[PDB]
């Protein structure tokens, strides 16, 4: 009872037999969380469509991820990736952002549990990839203690609105290292040009950042 | 011969430093504004002090005293009269002097006025035009409605004083009527309804005390800071208030008795202090709960 599913896509495939010629079977993809970090997704064939939506529903939630959610609203960090030819790229939001992302997305953060995130997706727009591509991205992302515990530091979470307040989010549950990380100066880092052109203003685009209703 | 300490002494800037406290929580509290994606760094123990440290640094220089003045005296300097032009103009001219590179204060702004009188602009219309020209973030033109009596208490009410207080440094000029009006009766509903812990790590504590202490009621203070186990800063208040009223009894008791620490709290009890009393008997439940712990 604690679960909800909602619909991502009902397809109608079809298949050729000797007997009847086009044989018409309904593909259903949904998705099932809690909204509690715990969501999965399935997909459910039949003939009826009332079969399809019950098999992939039912199947679903034997299939779990559990999501890791930064203070319970969004994701640790930046993820970007490519699922098959799928480019998803989040980028970690502030509390009052909003899920500005693919519908899809939408409807599988407020399944998880996700309530600010920033998502474009390129490439193919397969419905199969992306919501595929979107749980291996999630499941994989790394918390803040993972980070201390692997790296023996403390993680320190500077806030603009906080001023230099140095806010440490996890320790470094063994030991503590007492060498600093070595600071390299410059990072071979491969770096996003749609990121680097907005941020040098060159990116003009009439459908970015337009006015749309509350997610 | 024997000058008394002004607010800006160093000896008075230790104390009410002192007494106003640091806490870094509350200096940097979180504020209610756009926001952005936090950035995060890995740092050993000694660089997570260091930036500790440098916060430090940061909140005490968000927290230096604004400097007391003393109220401005009006502007009434007629430069010249002129009784040609009485009656030919019906409104009077405000001419105000644009160059850049002056400081506010020393500003040329004159009136013709329509009897043909050339006066030097008063102290709000001189405010009213350097604002008009050189537009400072966070003051208005005309006077906001807060602070009208009616809508000052509603923020009383709410326990929003050092909102009142930035609104008024805001607004208002440091030695304007209205500023020390705002921060008076700002200061009297804190003593009142004991709200001393509002402004406590803020920069307007230093300037509730200096009011307090020159006004001679103490009294509200001193028991706050006993019952929240303030005696250093509460000796400190006693000591100052001692500094600022040598010729009194208190002063002169504790020269007599060679008072220190908890005695001239005592001293200042009996002699000075209104609330002598309520004051023997906050300090006393203190030492008794001292005593305990020392056990």
């Not at chain 1, 298949?15 to 459910?44: D, H, Y």
């Not at chain 2, 506010?104 to 001189?126: M, N, Q």
Request: net charge positive; glycine share 6%.
């Amino acid at each position: 009872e604690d679960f909800d599913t909602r619909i991502l896509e009902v397809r109608n495939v079809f298949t050729m037999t000797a007997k009847e010629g086009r044989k018409k079977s309904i593909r259903v993809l949904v998705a099932v969380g809690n909204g509690k970090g715990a969501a999965g997704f399935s997909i459910g064939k039949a003939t009826d469509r009332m079969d399809a939506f019950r098999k992939a529903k039912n199947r679903a939630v034997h299939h779990l991820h559990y999501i890791e959610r930064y203070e319970d609203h969004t994701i640790f960090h930046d993820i970007s990736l490519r699922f098959k030819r799928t480019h998803i790229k989040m980028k970690k939001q502030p509390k009052g952002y909003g899920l500005r992302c693919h519908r899809a997305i939408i409807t599988i953060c407020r399944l998880i549990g996700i309530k600010d995130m920033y998502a474009k997706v390129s490439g193919s727009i397969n419905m199969l990839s992306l919501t595929q591509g979107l749980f291996r991205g999630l499941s994989r992302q790394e918390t803040h203690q993972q980070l201390a515990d692997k790296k023996g530091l403390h993680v320190v979470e500077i806030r603009e609105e906080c001023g230099p307040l140095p806010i440490v989010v996890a320790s470094p549950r063994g030991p503590l290292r007492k060498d600093p990380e070595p600071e390299d100066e410059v990072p071979d880092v491969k770096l996003d040009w749609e990121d680097v052109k907005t941020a040098q203003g060159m990116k003009r685009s009439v459908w970015s950042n337009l006015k749309r209703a509350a997610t | 011969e024997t000058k008394k300490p002004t607010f800006m002494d160093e000896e008075v800037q230790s104390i009410l430093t002192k007494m106003t406290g640091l806490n870094l929580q509350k200096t940097f509290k979180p504020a209610i504004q756009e926001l952005k994606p936090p950035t995060y760094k890995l740092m050993t123990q000694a660089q997570l002090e260091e930036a500790t440290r440098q916060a430090v640094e940061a909140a005490k220089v968000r927290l230096k005293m604004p400097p007391v003045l003393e109220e401005r005296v009006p502007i009434n300097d007629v430069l010249a009269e002129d009784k040609i032009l009485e009656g030919t103009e019906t409104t009077k001219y405000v001419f105000t002097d644009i160059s850049y590179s002056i400081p506010h204060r020393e500003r040329f702004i004159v009136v013709r006025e329509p009897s043909g009188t050339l006066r030097k602009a008063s102290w709000e219309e001189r405010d009213r035009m350097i604002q008009v020209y050189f537009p400072k973030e966070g003051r208005k033109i005309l006077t906001p409605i807060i602070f009208k009596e009616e809508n000052l208490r509603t923020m009383y009410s709410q326990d929003r004083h050092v909102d009142v207080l930035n609104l008024c440094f805001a607004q208002f000029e440091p030695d304007s009527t209205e500023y020390i009006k705002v921060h008076h009766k700002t200061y009297e509903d804190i003593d009142k309804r004991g709200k001393y812990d509002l402004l406590r790590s803020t920069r307007y504590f230093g300037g509730m005390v200096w009011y307090f202490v020159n006004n001679k009621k103490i009294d509200g203070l001193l028991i706050d800071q006993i019952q929240r186990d303030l005696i250093d800063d509460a000796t400190n208040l006693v000591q100052l208030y001692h500094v600022l009223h040598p010729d009194g009894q208190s002063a002169q008791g504790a020269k007599d008795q060679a008072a220190e620490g908890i005695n001239l709290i005592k001293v200042f009890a009996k002699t000075e202090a209104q609330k002598g009393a309520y004051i023997e008997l906050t300090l006393q439940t203190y030492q008794e709960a001292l005593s305990r712990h020392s056990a």
